[PDB]
Design a protein around this ligand. Structure first.
Ligand SMILES: COc1ccc(C(N)=S)cn1
Ligand SMILES: [Cl-]
Ligand SMILES: [Cl-]
Ligand SMILES: [Cl-]
Ligand SMILES: [Cl-]
Ligand SMILES: [Cl-]
Ligand SMILES: [Cl-]
Ligand SMILES: [Mg+2]
Length: 348
């Protein structure tokens, strides 16, 4: 057990191993209560997150366990990973606080590229890395559900990592109005058309790629209905085959009140773009999720010819999430979390 020291940060007392020095608050709080630090064991600048009231309710205790399980599993160059996890507690009986350590991420795609169009070679490399990480995530049967520019960390060498695992589900209010937390969502999850699956993430990648190419949000709706109208103008109204699959009778009835529209010509929407980029966007932005291209298929598309290497696009170890359908008491979720803290093995 390392020696811990204490100091006052973010309105509370933090207690951390000596290896972590020069702690200072960072960020806007989107991922939790976080400080930057220097890790003397590894030489990295790191982010240290102190969980707020991790075991105050059944919902919060299970969410803490979920975040730790997801972060311990992710081991890929284009996905956030766990450098360390610790508690000052010496036993389960005194366990109360959890701290997580990751690489410090300076900039995201949003704060870097807002209102700006990038060159085609840059778009190729950035979207390639998103898809490489997504192939890994989906191979573990994990659905991200919230891919958007603020969840993509990028460094000076245009290297990219996917963020946002195991945090609270987004609320109805967070999704209301003229807000970026809805602009990248697939229509079937935005409107609860049907039981969704991992194909929702490919819709989000299409929205991101379009925005890197034009410098503009693809579907900046002022509310759910305005956004649906923008989507259907581009990709066309649903045909009878997809209407069948909308298991919400009320949603199905609203869609049929709208006048029918054909799919638009994407070469006239994305004027001047690489024809291979136009072709890939047409295969991502398909209304029927059954027919969208997958991450593994998209890596082999000719748009990525200068980066694609099928021997360097790895998949994940199996991920057991049977706990997600399990009902337990607060102290049982807390005991499971403690076991996962003390069993952590740091990366090589
Ligand atoms: C220590 O910094 C952290 C910890 C966890 C997470 C996520 N759950 S994505 C993000 N930042
Ligand atoms: Cl230490
Ligand atoms: Cl990482
Ligand atoms: Cl503790
Ligand atoms: Cl964003
Ligand atoms: Cl969500
Ligand atoms: Cl597992
Ligand atoms: Mg999110």
């Amino acid at each position: 057990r390392p020696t811990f020291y204490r100091q006052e940060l973010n309105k509370t007392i933090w207690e951390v191993p000596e290896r972590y020095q020069n702690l200072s608050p960072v960020g806007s709080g989107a991922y939790g209560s976080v400080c930057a630090a220097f890790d003397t064991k590894t030489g990295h600048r790191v982010a240290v997150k102190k969980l707020s009231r991790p075991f105050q309710s059944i919902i919060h205790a299970k969410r803490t366990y979920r975040e730790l399980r997801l972060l311990k599993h992710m081991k890929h160059e284009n996905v956030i990973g766990l450098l360390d996890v610790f508690t000052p507690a010496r036993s389960l009986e005194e366990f109360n606080d959890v701290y997580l350590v990751t690489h410090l991420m300076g900039a995201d795609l949003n704060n870097i590229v807002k209102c700006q169009k990038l060159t085609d070679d840059h778009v190729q490399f950035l979207i390639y890395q998103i898809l490489r990480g997504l192939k890994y995530i989906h191979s573990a049967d994990i659905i991200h559900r919230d891919l958007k520019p603020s969840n993509l960390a990028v460094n000076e060498d245009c290297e990219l990592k996917i963020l946002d695992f195991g945090l609270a589900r987004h609320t109805d209010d967070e999704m209301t109005g003229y807000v970026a937390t809805r602009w990248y969502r697939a229509p079937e999850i935005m409107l609860n058309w049907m039981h969704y699956n991992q194909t929702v993430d490919i819709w989000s990648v299409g929205c991101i790629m379009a925005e890197l190419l034009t410098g503009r949000t693809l579907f900046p709706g002022t509310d759910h209905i305005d956004q649906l109208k923008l989507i259907l103008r581009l990709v066309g109204t649903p045909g009878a085959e997809l209407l069948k699959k909308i298991s919400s009778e009320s949603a199905r009835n609203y869609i049929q009140s709208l006048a029918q529209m054909p799919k638009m010509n994407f070469a006239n929407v994305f004027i001047g773009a690489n024809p291979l980029a136009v072709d890939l966007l047409e295969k991502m932005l398909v209304l029927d999720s059954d027919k969208r291209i997958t991450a593994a298929q998209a890596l082999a598309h000719a748009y990525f010819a200068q980066y694609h290497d099928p021997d360097d696009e790895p998949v994940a170890d199996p991920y057991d999430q049977s706990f997600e359908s399990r009902d337990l008491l607060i102290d049982e979720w807390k005991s499971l979390t403690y076991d996962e803290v003390i069993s952590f093995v740091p990366p090589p």
